A = this chain, B = another copy of it.
Amino acid sequence: SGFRKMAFPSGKVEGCMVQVTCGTTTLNGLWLDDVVYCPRHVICTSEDMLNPNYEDLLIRKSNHNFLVQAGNVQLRVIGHSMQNCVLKLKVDTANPKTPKYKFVRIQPGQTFSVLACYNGSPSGVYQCAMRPNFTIKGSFLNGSCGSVGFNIDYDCVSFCYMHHMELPTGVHAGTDLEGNFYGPFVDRQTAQAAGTDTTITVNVLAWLYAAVINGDRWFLNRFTTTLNDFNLVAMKYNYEPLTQDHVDILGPLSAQTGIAVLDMCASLKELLQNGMNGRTILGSALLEDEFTPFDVVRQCSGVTFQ
The residues of A with any CB-CB pair to B shorter than 8 Å are 1-12, 14-15, 71, 115-119, 121-126, 128, 137-144, 166, 170-172, 214-215, 280, 283-286, 298-306
Chain B contacts of A302 at CB under 8 A?
118, 123, 141-144
Determine whether the beta carbon of A170 is less than 8 Å from that of B11: no
Chain B contacts of A300 at CB under 8 A?
141
Known: A5-B5, A11-B15. 13 other contacts (CB 8 A): A2-B137, A4-B124, A6-B125, A7-B7, A9-B122, A9-B124, A9-B125, A10-B125, A125-B125, A141-B300, A142-B302, A170-B214, A284-B285
| Interface of chain A: mostly helix, strand, loop or mixed | loop
Q: Which residue of B lies closest to A12 (CB)?
A: B11
- Bound-complex Cα distance A5 to B12 (A): 21
Chain B contacts of A10 at CB under 8 A?
9-11, 125
Report, nearest first, the 6 A-B pairs whose CB atoms are least far apart: A11-B11, A285-B285, A121-B304, A6-B124, A2-B139, A9-B122
Most buried by B among A14, A116, A119, A123: A123
Specify how many copies of this chain sit in the oligomer.
Answer: 2
Determine whether the beta carbon of B11 is less than 8 Å from that of A9: yes
Chain B contacts of A215 at CB under 8 A?
170
Determine whether the beta carbon of B126 is less than 8 Å from that of A170: no
- Bound-complex Cα distance A116 to B4 (A): 11
Determine whether the beta carbon of B15 is less than 8 Å from that of A123: no
